[PDB]
Amino acid sequence: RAARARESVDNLYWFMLAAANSAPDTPAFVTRGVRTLSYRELRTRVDDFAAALAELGLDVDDRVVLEANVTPDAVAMLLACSLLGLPFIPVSPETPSGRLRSILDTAEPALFAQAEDGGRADVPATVGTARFGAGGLRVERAPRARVRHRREIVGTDTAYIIFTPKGVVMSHRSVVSLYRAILEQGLITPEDRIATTSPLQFDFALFDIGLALGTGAALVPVPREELNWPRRFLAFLGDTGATQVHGVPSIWRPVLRHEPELLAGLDRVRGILFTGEDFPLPELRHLQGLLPHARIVNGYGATESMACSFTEVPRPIPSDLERLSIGFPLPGFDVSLLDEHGRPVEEIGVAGQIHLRAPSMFSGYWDDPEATARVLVSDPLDPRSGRTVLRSGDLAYRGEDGELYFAGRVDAQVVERRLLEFPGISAAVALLLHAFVVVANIVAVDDIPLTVNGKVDRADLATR
């Protein structure tokens, strides 16, 4: 009686668990005492969680809030939700009760699921509650009864919604389409062990989980506690055998400050990937210098396409490089640089708004058709087809070879990188005009404050 996505249909369950068919006994997870979990045991876990979820009688398109960080149990849950066409809303357990309530009021999910050891209480009675562990999914309060209307699950069904409220809706066809494009460009192999640092509510964790499991590689989730302490973090990457380290630039700040020598001892790290914001070039030159046998990739993209471009940094980085390239869109992705009037910008070095044609496009903003119509727009180069493109809110310019350079947001123009030129300045935040700098008004500080997702907390700086 529960709809299950068929093998022939774009769905996270089939995409991420292909390796259970082809290599059941290869490790899918490495966690902490270093233990592996097989693709086979991972799949059995997804299936058990799916059986328990199926019994609740949720229709396809019914929403499950998933409060957890990147764990084998949290990934088995989102894959079980995926199989049953139940869109997952990932929420980090470090989210204030206030912001979870706001998500629960807009999303109106049928079910809220957290870990057995998780400590969320005071979820309202309108929403069902459950708890997951390797033992199984245990229901505290059953969702209200309903009639199931959807017969079959399809590729355009919603896989996940990312809330910041702003809810980016993403189809299984869209996510899998990005996973395929980056598997094509050959960024990692089944032999790799991917250190992922992002919280689960940030699609960079969904990228890392999908990239890894889709390839047949092992995921190495780094808990936030291990991450906070430079020596704890490096010992974690060491003990788990990480070959690839994925994170926002900020994961490196403490280790470059307090433990440069020890970071130079990650003899097994073949790669580093970052996205989310500019990597300060001084910090980036230092990390490259200490790990010379590690490929470093600049990943550019937004939640509404999951991602867009992946560009290897020059090795070494030119010491008077003004800006890093965000390179070329993935095969099957295409960027126009349009001026204020939607006209192409064919002049090298002139900034225009990135308009993205992608096979990984979001379905829309949850319950916000007016916002959707401002962002997901008629292709200005083919306005009559009804083709839509992402109006990105990102400015960029091209070099002589057609490479892109991120030039900040349209909405932020009303200094950072000309302070990075000054000796001893390793990271600089300017906002509206104060400036805050890591060594009108200018305040030197120790570290920059971070959002939960690990970006420059500009709002927090604004208030001091």
Ligand X SMILES: Nc1ncnc2c1ncn2[C@@H]1O[C@H](COS(=O)(=O)NC(=O)C[C@H](N)c2cccc(Br)c2)[C@@H](O)[C@H]1O
Given candidates 15, 204, 362, 365, which one binds ligand X under the rule CB under 6 A? 204
Given candidates 84, 89, 284, 358, which one binds a second copy under the rule CB under 8 A? 358
- Binding map of Ca ion across residues 326-365, x = CB under 5 A, - = no contact: ----------------------------------------
- How far is the C-alpha of 159 from the C-alpha of 142, rounded, in Å? 22
| CB-based closest residue to ligand X | 299
Choice between 48 and 61, CB closer to a second copy: 61
In the range 383-402, which residues lie near ligand X by CB under 6 A? Answer: 394
Q: Find the length of the chain.
A: 464
- Please give the span between the terminal C-alpha atoms of the chain, in angstroms, as a whole number: 57
Choice between 41 and 394, CB closer to ligand X: 394
The answer to whether residues 427 and 448 touch, using CB atoms and an 8 Å cutoff, is: yes
- Helix-helix angle 12-22:39-54, to 10 degrees: 140
Task: Please report how close the Cβ of residue 58 comes to Ca ion at its closest, in angstroms.
Answer: 9
| 67 contact choice in Ca ion, ligand X, a second copy, none (CB below 5 to 8 Å, kind-dependent) | none
| 201 contact choice in Ca ion, ligand X, a second copy, none (CB below 5 to 8 Å, kind-dependent) | none
DSSP E strand boundaries for 264-387? 271-274, 295-300, 309-312, 334-338, 352-357, 364-365, 376-378
- How far is the C-alpha of 99 from the C-alpha of 179, rounded, in Å? 30
Given candidates 9, 176, 218, 255, which one binds a second copy under the rule CB under 8 A? 9
| 413 contact choice in a second copy, Ca ion, ligand X, none (CB below 5 to 8 Å, kind-dependent) | none
382 is in an annotated binding site: no
CB atoms within 10 A of CB 108: 12
Choice between 157 and 394, CB closer to Ca ion: 157
Q: Which residues contact 65 (CB under 8 A, 6 or more apart)?
A: 88, 89, 91, 100, 103, 104, 107, 109, 111, 112, 113, 127
| 394 contact choice in ligand X, a second copy, Ca ion, none (CB below 5 to 8 Å, kind-dependent) | ligand X
Determine the 3-state secondary structure of 19 from DSSP: helix
- What is the number of alpha carbons within 13 Å of residue 312 lying toward its C-beta? 10
Count of residues of this chain found to bind ligand X when the rule CB under 6 A is applied: 19
Given candidates 141, 374, 387, 418, which one binds a second copy under the rule CB under 8 A? 387
- What is the number of alpha carbons within 13 Å of residue 453 lying toward its C-beta? 21
- Binding map of ligand X across residues 155-194, x = CB under 6 A, - = no contact: ----------------------------------------
Q: Is there binding between residue 336 and a second copy (CB under 8 A)?
A: yes
Residues paired with residue 244 on neighbouring β-strands, in sequence order: 194, 271
Given candidates 26, 38, 106, 303, which one binds ligand X under the rule CB under 6 A? 303
Task: Tell the residue number behind the tokens 């000309």, with chain if given.
Answer: 418
Q: Is there binding between residue 381 and Ca ion (CB under 5 A)?
A: yes
Choice between 87 and 230, CB closer to ligand X: 87
Choice between 300 and 366, CB closer to a second copy: 366
In the range 394-453, which residues lie near a second copy by CB under 8 A? Answer: 402
- How far is the C-alpha of 240 from the C-alpha of 10, rounded, in Å? 32
- The DSSP-derived string for 51-109 is HHHHTT-PPTT--EEEE--S-HHHHHHHHHHHHTT--EEEE-TTS-HHHHHHHHHHH--
- How far is the C-alpha of 70 from the C-alpha of 49, rounded, in Å? 16
Task: Please name the amino acid found at residue 340.
Answer: E
- How far is the C-alpha of 66 from the C-alpha of 49, rounded, in Å? 13
The answer to whether residues 89 and 65 touch, using CB atoms and an 8 Å cutoff, is: yes
Which residues of this chain interact with a second copy, rule CB under 8 A? 6, 8-10, 59, 61, 87, 147, 149-158, 161, 169, 171, 173, 177, 180-181, 184, 329, 331-336, 344, 346, 357-359, 361, 363-367, 369, 372, 376, 378-379, 381-382, 384-387, 402
Question: Which residues participate in the annotated binding site for ADP?
Answer: 275-276, 278, 298-299, 303, 394
Which residues of this chain interact with ligand X, rule CB under 6 A? 203-204, 207, 275-278, 298-303, 306-307, 326, 394, 406, 409
Question: Which residues participate in the annotated binding site for Ca(2+)?
Answer: 61, 381
